[PDB]
Design an enzyme around this catalytic site. Structure first.
Site, PDB file in Angstrom:
ATOM      1  N   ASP A  43     -19.396 -26.194  -2.974  1.00 10.18           N
ATOM      2  CA  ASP A  43     -19.170 -26.833  -2.319  1.00 10.18           C
ATOM      3  C   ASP A  43     -17.670 -26.846  -2.112  1.00 10.18           C
ATOM      4  O   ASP A  43     -17.006 -27.125  -2.349  1.00 10.18           O
ATOM      5  CB  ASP A  43     -19.278 -27.697  -2.924  1.00 10.18           C
ATOM      6  CG  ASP A  43     -19.456 -29.535  -1.499  1.00 10.18           C
ATOM      7  OD1 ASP A  43     -18.501 -29.771  -0.924  1.00 10.18           O
ATOM      8  OD2 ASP A  43     -20.386 -30.542  -1.975  1.00 10.18           O
ATOM      9  N   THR A  44     -17.037 -26.403  -0.714  1.00 10.83           N
ATOM     10  CA  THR A  44     -15.788 -26.576  -0.043  1.00 10.83           C
ATOM     11  C   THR A  44     -15.346 -27.233   0.130  1.00 10.83           C
ATOM     12  O   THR A  44     -13.976 -27.674  -0.374  1.00 10.83           O
ATOM     13  CB  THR A  44     -15.858 -25.873   0.460  1.00 10.83           C
ATOM     14  OG1 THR A  44     -16.579 -26.296   2.082  1.00 10.83           O
ATOM     15  CG2 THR A  44     -16.838 -24.094   0.317  1.00 10.83           C
ATOM     16  N   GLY A  45     -16.350 -28.939   0.407  1.00 12.00           N
ATOM     17  CA  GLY A  45     -15.507 -30.314   0.199  1.00 12.00           C
ATOM     18  C   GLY A  45     -15.462 -30.743  -1.302  1.00 12.00           C
ATOM     19  O   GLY A  45     -14.575 -31.435  -1.073  1.00 12.00           O
TER      20      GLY A  45
HETATM   21  N1  LIG Z   1     -12.010 -35.481  -5.684  1.00 11.63           N
HETATM   22  C1  LIG Z   1     -13.401 -34.616  -6.638  1.00 11.63           C
HETATM   23  O1  LIG Z   1     -13.111 -33.274  -6.958  1.00 11.63           O
HETATM   24  C2  LIG Z   1     -14.773 -35.018  -5.405  1.00 11.63           C
HETATM   25  C3  LIG Z   1     -15.497 -35.918  -5.048  1.00 11.63           C
HETATM   26  C4  LIG Z   1     -16.016 -36.120  -4.504  1.00 11.63           C
HETATM   27  C5  LIG Z   1     -17.293 -35.161  -4.522  1.00 11.63           C
HETATM   28  S1  LIG Z   1     -18.565 -34.815  -4.271  1.00 11.63           S
HETATM   29  O2  LIG Z   1     -19.272 -35.373  -4.967  1.00 11.63           O
HETATM   30  O3  LIG Z   1     -18.713 -36.697  -2.791  1.00 11.63           O
HETATM   31  N2  LIG Z   1     -19.485 -34.018  -3.219  1.00 11.63           N
HETATM   32  C6  LIG Z   1     -20.479 -33.344  -3.337  1.00 11.63           C
HETATM   33  C7  LIG Z   1     -21.919 -33.313  -3.021  1.00 11.63           C
HETATM   34  C8  LIG Z   1     -22.414 -34.884  -2.732  1.00 11.63           C
HETATM   35  C9  LIG Z   1     -23.646 -35.160  -2.651  1.00 11.63           C
HETATM   36  C10 LIG Z   1     -24.680 -34.323  -2.205  1.00 11.63           C
HETATM   37  C11 LIG Z   1     -25.654 -35.027  -1.518  1.00 11.63           C
HETATM   38  F1  LIG Z   1     -25.341 -34.285  -0.212  1.00 11.63           F
HETATM   39  F2  LIG Z   1     -26.532 -33.683  -2.594  1.00 11.63           F
HETATM   40  F3  LIG Z   1     -25.754 -36.692  -1.523  1.00 11.63           F
HETATM   41  C12 LIG Z   1     -23.385 -33.064  -1.441  1.00 11.63           C
HETATM   42  C13 LIG Z   1     -22.635 -32.780  -2.020  1.00 11.63           C
HETATM   43  C14 LIG Z   1     -18.767 -33.957  -1.719  1.00 11.63           C
HETATM   44  C15 LIG Z   1     -17.837 -32.680  -1.070  1.00 11.63           C
HETATM   45  N3  LIG Z   1     -19.373 -32.276  -0.165  1.00 11.63           N
HETATM   46  C16 LIG Z   1     -20.032 -33.289   0.008  1.00 11.63           C
HETATM   47  C17 LIG Z   1     -19.567 -34.594  -0.835  1.00 11.63           C
HETATM   48  N4  LIG Z   1     -19.019 -35.291   0.363  1.00 11.63           N
HETATM   49  C18 LIG Z   1     -18.030 -35.043   1.262  1.00 11.63           C
HETATM   50  C19 LIG Z   1     -16.520 -35.710   0.865  1.00 11.63           C
HETATM   51  C20 LIG Z   1     -16.187 -36.429  -0.205  1.00 11.63           C
HETATM   52  C21 LIG Z   1     -14.896 -36.635  -1.193  1.00 11.63           C
HETATM   53  C22 LIG Z   1     -14.092 -36.103  -0.201  1.00 11.63           C
HETATM   54  C23 LIG Z   1     -13.081 -35.942  -0.692  1.00 11.63           C
HETATM   55  F4  LIG Z   1     -12.013 -35.469   0.078  1.00 11.63           F
HETATM   56  F5  LIG Z   1     -12.478 -37.667  -0.820  1.00 11.63           F
HETATM   57  F6  LIG Z   1     -12.408 -35.483  -1.597  1.00 11.63           F
HETATM   58  C24 LIG Z   1     -14.687 -34.860   0.729  1.00 11.63           C
HETATM   59  C25 LIG Z   1     -15.646 -34.533   0.675  1.00 11.63           C
HETATM   60  S2  LIG Z   1     -20.160 -37.162   0.891  1.00 11.63           S
HETATM   61  O4  LIG Z   1     -20.845 -37.293  -0.014  1.00 11.63           O
HETATM   62  O5  LIG Z   1     -19.269 -37.521   1.171  1.00 11.63           O
HETATM   63  C26 LIG Z   1     -20.762 -36.065   1.930  1.00 11.63           C
HETATM   64  C27 LIG Z   1     -21.047 -36.416   2.866  1.00 11.63           C
HETATM   65  C28 LIG Z   1     -22.065 -35.536   3.764  1.00 11.63           C
HETATM   66  C29 LIG Z   1     -22.715 -35.372   3.925  1.00 11.63           C
HETATM   67  C30 LIG Z   1     -23.825 -35.084   5.219  1.00 11.63           C
HETATM   68  N5  LIG Z   1     -25.373 -35.181   4.995  1.00 11.63           N
HETATM   69  O6  LIG Z   1     -23.659 -34.628   5.545  1.00 11.63           O
HETATM   70  C31 LIG Z   1     -23.503 -35.622   2.800  1.00 11.63           C
HETATM   71  C32 LIG Z   1     -22.956 -35.902   1.247  1.00 11.63           C
HETATM   72  C33 LIG Z   1     -16.974 -34.171  -5.686  1.00 11.63           C
HETATM   73  C34 LIG Z   1     -15.950 -33.708  -5.936  1.00 11.63           C
END
Ligand SMILES: NC(=O)c1ccc(S(=O)(=O)N(Cc2ccc(C(F)(F)F)cc2)[C@H]2CNC[C@@H]2N(Cc2ccc(C(F)(F)F)cc2)S(=O)(=O)c2ccc(C(N)=O)cc2)cc1
Ligand SMILES: [Cl-]
Ligand SMILES: [Cl-]
EC number: 3.4.23.16
Lengths: 99, 99
Positions: free
Chosen positions: B25-27
């Protein structure tokens, strides 16, 4: 491009004629943008994030350019922490993970 | 390897003697795993995204094997819906985005 991950992979996109910053997020299935105006009709979508499921607006067949690469696909609009380019459009621009 | 984004980029990891499935997960800035025991000191943290925030426990200097690659770094543990390998460990295995 080859983009390393020591910093957030933030890129410029173009949508609606406007430049925005967005994150390339391989963990997002979908593309989710901050509140903005888009043409046409929208459909409801529930997406699951880290903190729960939420409602967003789904717009289909939207033109969007990502780092200069053209795409046309589904864009969700809702309360996201940052504009996110997810796998539906990363696949269109030919993005892969490599190690 | 070269990993496609047509499907979620799911891989097998080994941590604490356990084999797990996890999303590359690059995000995600940091790695987040479902509830488990890890050795050492920890401190609380909140992480957030769509749907809101969750509380996690932050462990540092943890060993994870990812596709045969050993990588050391912070692991956050808590009620995430999916195991996530974040940038903090993707860098260590030399993972890049390419298009
Ligand atoms: N600060 C950190 O270390 C950190 C912050 C957030 C996360 S995260 O758990 O939110 N994450 C991984 C993730 C969560 C849930 C899923 C699920 F779909 F299976 F439920 C998958 C992956 C984030 C990174 N990849 C997606 C996820 N989101 C986006 C996000 C959150 C916070 C940031 C920020 F910059 F603020 F740190 C960036 C990006 S999410 O949860 O908002 C999301 C968004 C869209 C979708 C989709 N279906 O398209 C799914 C999930 C991880 C580390
Ligand atoms: Cl699409
Ligand atoms: Cl590097």
């Amino acid at each position: 491009p080859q983009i390393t991950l020591w910093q957030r992979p933030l890129v410029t996109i173009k949508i609606g004629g406007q430049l925005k910053e967005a994150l390339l997020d391989t963990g997002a299935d979908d593309t989710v943008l901050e509140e903005m105006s888009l043409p046409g009709r929208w459909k409801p979508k529930m997406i699951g994030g880290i903190g729960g499921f939420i409602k967003v607006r789904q717009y289909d067949q939207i033109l969007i350019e990502i780092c200069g690469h053209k795409a046309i696909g589904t864009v969700l609009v809702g309360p996201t922490p940052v504009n996110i380019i997810g796998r539906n459009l990363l696949t269109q621009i030919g993005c892969t993970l490599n190690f």
